[PDB]
Ligand SMILES: *[C@@H]1O[C@H](CO)[C@@H](O[C@@H]2O[C@H](CO)[C@@H](O[C@@H]3O[C@H](CO[C@H]4O[C@H](CO)[C@@H](O)[C@H](O)[C@@H]4O)[C@@H](O)[C@H](O[C@H]4O[C@H](CO)[C@@H](O)[C@H](O)[C@@H]4O)[C@@H]3O)[C@H](O)[C@H]2NC(C)=O)[C@H](O)[C@H]1NC(C)=O
Ligand SMILES: *[C@@H]1O[C@H](CO)[C@@H](O)[C@H](O)[C@H]1NC(C)=O
């Protein structure tokens with residue numbers, strides 16, 4: 001029933017950010033779409 | 049983790065001629081599989 005998050009902005013191995021007691025089973029995740037006037041082959045060639 | 053939820057008698061969720069204008073919900077007696085008792089013994093409530 002506890003959520004745990006680790007991250008790294010430098011190197012590959014992650015380090016502990018935080019833990020959070022929820023008491024409920026998480027069951028889904030979703031990467032939110034990002035809308036932008038940039039980030040495409042016809043404007044800057046960048047990609048998410 | 050906590051209880052995922054009480055089982056609902058689905059034959060008590062919605063209304064008999066209910067169209068799409070009404071939203072789905074169940075009456076309070078539709079939730080089953082639970083019970084209660086007092087915690088009181090000798091004028092004190094017992095706690096774990
Ligand atoms: C917790 O999260 C739930 C959703 O999961 C939220 O519940 C919803 O709340 C909204 C806002 O109260 C409900 O909105 C519906 O709006 C319809 C009209 O919208 C237009 O008009 C208004 C101005 O009047 C504009 O602001 C809006 O942008 C639109 O242009 C109403 O017609 C809906 O009415 C309901 O009841 C009547 C009968 O009285 C029926 O005829 C309708 O069909 C409908 O059932 C309603 O007001 C939305 O419906 C809610 N959804 C659910 C599933 O309940 C909670 O608000 C939120 N709570 C908190 C604290 O975060
Ligand atoms: C993106 O890259 C392609 C291939 O090199 C090129 O044809 C296109 O003009 C580039 N677009 C921009 C905005 O630089």
Ligand SMILES: *[C@@H]1O[C@H](CO)[C@@H](O)[C@H](O)[C@H]1NC(C)=O
Nearest residue numbers: 063065066067068069070071
């Ligand atoms: C729901 O829709 C039906 C069909 O139009 C209508 O008979 C009924 O009165 C409506 N009920 C409500 C609560 O709007």
